[PDB]
Amino acid sequence: EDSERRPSCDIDKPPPNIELTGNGYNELTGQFRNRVINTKSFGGQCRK
Amino acid sequence: PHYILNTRFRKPYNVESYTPQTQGKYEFILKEYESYSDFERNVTEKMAS
């Protein structure tokens, strides 16, 4: 319900490629690998 | 909420990640080869009486 909903934070924007920080890594080809850590579990927090 | 530059996007349920991964390469080569040759050969012979 819109009566039950509340603001979690003032903004929705992350640092511009925070996504790449949660990728996996293949040491032996040297390349990055697909999404391992959820980079954006805001966790109901307004850490700005 | 997902962002690229300042534009905001919706991710299809089927897709794990769409992310800029923003990488660029340029590779350039220029080559020249040149070769030149010039040959000149002559004869002269004379007699008188």
Swiss-Prot record, chain A:
Cell compartments where the protein resides: Secreted; Target cell membrane
S-S pairs: C9-C46
Basic and acidic residues composition bias: residue spans: 2-13
Domain of life of the source: Eukaryota
Similarity comment: family membership: Belongs to the complement C6/C7/C8/C9 family.
Assembly and interaction partners: Monomer or dimer; as a C5b-7 complex it can also form multimeric rosettes. Component of the membrane attack complex (MAC), composed of complement C5b, C6, C7, C8A, C8B, C8G and multiple copies of the pore-forming subunit C9.
Connected disease: Complement component 7 deficiency: A rare defect of the complement classical pathway associated with susceptibility to severe recurrent infections, predominantly by Neisseria gonorrhoeae or Neisseria meningitidis.
Function in brief: Component of the membrane attack complex (MAC), a multiprotein complex activated by the complement cascade, which inserts into a target cell membrane and forms a pore, leading to target cell membrane rupture and cell lysis. The MAC is initiated by proteolytic cleavage of C5 into complement C5b in response to the classical, alternative, lectin and GZMK complement pathways. The complement pathways consist in a cascade of proteins that leads to phagocytosis and breakdown of pathogens and signaling that strengthens the adaptive immune system. C7 serves as a membrane anchor.
The protein, known as: Complement component C7
Name of encoding gene: C7
From Swiss-Prot, chain B:
Glycosylation sites recorded in the entry for this protein: N42
Domain of life: Eukaryota
Subcellular location: Secreted; Target cell membrane
Post-translational modification as stated in the protein's UniProt record: N-glycosylated; contains one or two bound glycans. Not O-glycosylated.
Known disease link: Complement component 8 deficiency, 2: A rare defect of the complement classical pathway associated with susceptibility to severe recurrent infections, predominantly by Neisseria gonorrhoeae or Neisseria meningitidis.
Annotated function: Component of the membrane attack complex (MAC), a multiprotein complex activated by the complement cascade, which inserts into a target cell membrane and forms a pore, leading to target cell membrane rupture and cell lysis. The MAC is initiated by proteolytic cleavage of C5 into complement C5b in response to the classical, alternative, lectin and GZMK complement pathways. The complement pathways consist in a cascade of proteins that leads to phagocytosis and breakdown of pathogens and signaling that strengthens the adaptive immune system.
Subunit composition and interactions: Heterotrimer of 3 chains: alpha (C8A), beta (C8B) and gamma (C8G); the alpha and gamma chains are disulfide bonded. Component of the membrane attack complex (MAC), composed of complement C5b, C6, C7, C8A, C8B, C8G and multiple copies of the pore-forming subunit C9.
Record-stated family: Belongs to the complement C6/C7/C8/C9 family.
Protein name per Swiss-Prot or TrEMBL: Complement component C8 beta chain
Organism taxonomic ancestry: Eukaryota, Metazoa, Chordata, Craniata, Vertebrata
Gene that this polypeptide is encoded by: C8B
Span within the parent record: 202 to 250 of 591
